[PDB]
């Protein structure tokens, strides 16, 4: 509902050879806008949508600076967490972070977050009040005490409340023609007679944005939604998304089943059938 800006950091350790790969991606809602990779020679913060090229080179230099520095913080942090868990230097390990802000009716911050995972598992998270931490295990209590005593919460809070939402507003203005348009699903139902007599009905939703959508199948006699084969929501390749939900129905009974499509790009919910 409210717009958001987020960054996704992935740091991977290299077995017994001291470096660490750092990958960062920037999103405004469900649209990737920036990227950074320190495998590249002379790594830089690079744009990955047309609109962010509105920003001049001052922006790109500064952001490049800050994600290079962040990148070495994550290298050290990898070696530290490997310390806490008493792991060897022969295996590769992963340190991930995601953080971001949602812009509220005020022009201010609705809510914001910062979460950290080690080897794919929850490690530490900032709480809703932006003044306290939640440690996922024994080691994250070490990190937690450290971060309370140093008031790291106020660094992430002043960022979320200040720079994060201000930049979010600017980015929403720059890409006004793409980021503020919710695009509804184009929908239709296909029919596949296939199991001697069972017929497969497949309800498609293509071309929509943002990501979140709901598709369910309903049968005329029953209040609960039907069992269905549902694919994970997937990118179209052009900035939109797509999904389908299918089920097998007895031959001749297709008009008992309805597909229900909910998306915030639609005026009201959509009912659709094999016509």
């Amino acid at each position: 509902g409210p717009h958001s800006l987020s960054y996704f950091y992935t740091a991977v350790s290299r077995p017994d050879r001291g470096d660490s790969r750092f990958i960062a991606v920037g999103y405004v809602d469900d649209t990737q806008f920036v990227r950074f990779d320190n495998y590249a020679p002379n790594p830089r913060m690079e744009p990955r949508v047309p609109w962010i090229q509105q920003e001049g080179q001052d922006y790109w230099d500064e952001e490049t600076r800050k994600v290079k520095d962040n990148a070495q913080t994550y290298g050290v942090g990898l070696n530290t967490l490997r310390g806490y868990y008493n792991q060897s230097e022969a295996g590769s390990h992963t340190l991930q972070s995601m953080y971001g802000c949602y812009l509220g009716p005020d022009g201010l911050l609705l809510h914001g977050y910062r979460q950290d995972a080690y080897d794919g598992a929850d490690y530490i998270a900032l709480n809703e009040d932006l003044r306290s931490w939640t440690a996922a295990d024994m080691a994250a209590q070490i990190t937690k005490r450290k971060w309370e005593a140093a008031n790291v919460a106020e660094r992430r809070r002043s960022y979320l409340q200040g720079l994060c939402v201000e930049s979010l507003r600017r980015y929403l203005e720059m890409g006004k023609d793409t980021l503020q348009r919710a695009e509804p699903p184009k929908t239709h139902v296909t029919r596949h007679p296939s199991s001697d007599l069972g017929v497969t009905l497949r309800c498609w939703a293509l071309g929509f944005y943002p990501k979140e959508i709901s598709l369910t199948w309903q049968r005329e006699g029953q209040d609960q939604s039907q069992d269905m084969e549902l694919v994970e929501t997937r990118p179209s390749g052009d900035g939109t998304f797509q999904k389908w939900a299918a089920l097998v129905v007895p031959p001749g009974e297709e008009q008992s089943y309805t597909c229900h499509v909910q998306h915030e790009g639609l005026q009201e919910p959509l009912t659709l059938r094999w016509d």
């Binding site: 800050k66 913080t73 530290t80 790291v152 960022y159």
Partner: peptide, 9 residues
């Protein structure tokens, strides 16, 4: 704009 992430874990 990025956060500045500088404190050790």
């Amino acid at each position: 704009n990025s956060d500045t992430v500088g404190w050790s874990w």
